[PDB]
Write a protein that binds this ligand. Structure first.
Ligand SMILES: O=c1ccn([C@@H]2O[C@H](COP(=O)(O)OP(=O)(O)O[C@H]3O[C@H](CO)[C@@H](O)[C@H](O)[C@H]3O)[C@@H](O)[C@H]2O)c(=O)[nH]1
Length: 395
């Protein structure tokens, strides 16, 4: 019947946007859903009809320029452990008189896995990124995560992680606890999961995506004459590239028929870019998904969320990866023939312009984009995700 579903995430657009429509659907079907979220995102999540349950997070918030995420994986996992340790008691208290029938959580929310186990309720991981295949432990986890860190920093990380887990009655190795959920819905296109053939289907179910108007974000109107709209965005975090943005202005400025929407983040000011020609507009934040329904090209850092939205609208990409997993994703995008990967250094005005002109006229990039878009249309929709979640509800 109508149950209590509690969703858990952090204040990061890439970890909240991919599941908003699913939360909205669960509310619409009559479930009472709470959304554990840091205060800066309360409004953003309240837009789904779920009630925000607030808690203080120590992770970098996207609104504050004084903060930034690290570029390396090991520092990020450090951040997630620290945040989890201080966030768990707050969330335990907040939910002490109302324990949900099911727990939904983004991959970053360790407290949700701990509270799920201590409560005895099911937990569903919602992954806005790729998941472990069978053989992940021997192919990447041991060679690239564990074996390169037999350091005092590594040993400290594991000692604190396992002390925290064992403090909470959990005996799993920290790495299986973090990287191997018992049940997960994968919100990315199968076409972009490495070794999708070897992903345990009894654990993971690809639901691809379904995106609706984030009407809260407002709209963007195509200006008159703008035949080819190109959006430039390096995301929410790794956005401090003023030299690259100036190269974008010089690649598309005054190009007849092209219009450039340049999203520069909040650590670069428009003044840093010089005089702007009439066909280029600059923002520190854009309604990105609305612009991707109208864009002919997307110059992206290849973050998972932006890539998902672009593929969902079948817009060709120039992938300029900035940090962490983006490089791998850029490579996959190029490996699928829907994007060109450029390093930030080599992204000069002339090569940006000729790469964009090439991508938008290439019939083969369009047909591989439509194929991926149809595959995503066929891994169910939001209603299949809500069905699988409801299926995890007990009696
Ligand atoms: O002007 C803008 C800029 C971005 N977005 C949206 O913001 C979300 C971000 O998507 P994604 O590109 O996947 O996230 P990023 O900001 O690129 O990356 C983060 O992903 C990791 C998750 O913790 C961390 O390393 C840091 O947050 C950072 O790397 C997407 O839904 C975009 O549509 C907008 O709506 N308007």
């Amino acid at each position: 019947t109508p149950a209590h579903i509690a969703m858990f995430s952090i204040a990061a657009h890439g970890h909240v946007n991919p599941s908003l429509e699913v939360i909205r659907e669960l509310v619409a079907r009559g479930h009472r859903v709470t959304y554990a979220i840091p205060p800066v995102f309360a409004d953003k999540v309240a837009a789904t009809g779920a009630r925000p349950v607030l808690y203080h997070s120590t992770l970098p918030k996207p609104s504050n320029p004084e903060e930034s995420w690290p570029e390396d994986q090991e520092s990020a996992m450090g951040l997630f452990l620290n945040d989890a340790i201080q966030a768990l008691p707050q969330l335990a208290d907040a939910y002490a008189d109302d324990i949900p029938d099911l727990v939904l959580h983004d991959i970053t929310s360790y407290p949700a896995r701990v509270l799920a186990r201590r409560w005895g309720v099911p937990a569903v991981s919602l992954s806005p990124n790729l998941v472990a295949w069978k053989g992940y432990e021997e192919e990447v986890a041991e060679p690239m995560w564990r074996e390169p860190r037999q350091t005092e920093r590594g040993r400290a990380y594991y000692a604190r992680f396992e002390a925290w887990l064992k403090e909470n009655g959990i005996t799993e190795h920290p790495d299986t606890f973090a990287s191997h959920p018992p049940r997960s819905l994968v919100l990315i296109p199968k076409a972009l999961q490495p070794h999708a053939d070897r992903v345990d289907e009894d654990v993971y179910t690809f639901v691809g995506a379904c995106q609706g108007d984030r009407a809260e974000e407002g709209g963007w109107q195509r200006p008159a004459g703008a035949e080819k709209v190109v959006l430039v965005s390096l995301g929410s975090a790794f956005t401090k590239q003023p030299a690259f943005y100036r190269e974008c202005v010089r690649a598309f400025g005054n190009l007849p028929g092209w219009h450039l929407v340049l999203q520069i983040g909040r650590k670069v000011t428009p003044a840093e870019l010089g005089e702007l020609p009439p066909n280029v507009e600059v923002h520190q934040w854009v309604p990105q998904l609305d612009i991707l329904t109208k864009a002919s090209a997307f110059i992206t850092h290849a973050g998972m969320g932006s890539t998902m939205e672009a593929l969902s609208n079948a817009v060709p990409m120039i992938a300029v990866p900035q940090a962490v997993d983006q490089f791998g994703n850029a490579d996959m995008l190029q490996g699928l023939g829907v994007a060109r990967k450029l390093a930030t250094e080599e992204a000069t005005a002339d090569l940006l312009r000729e790469t964009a002109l090439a991508l938008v006229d290439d019939p083969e990039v369009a047909r591989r984009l439509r194929r991926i878009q149809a595959e995503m249309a066929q891994e169910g929709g939001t209603r299949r995700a809500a069905d699988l979640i409801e299926a995890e509800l007990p009696a």
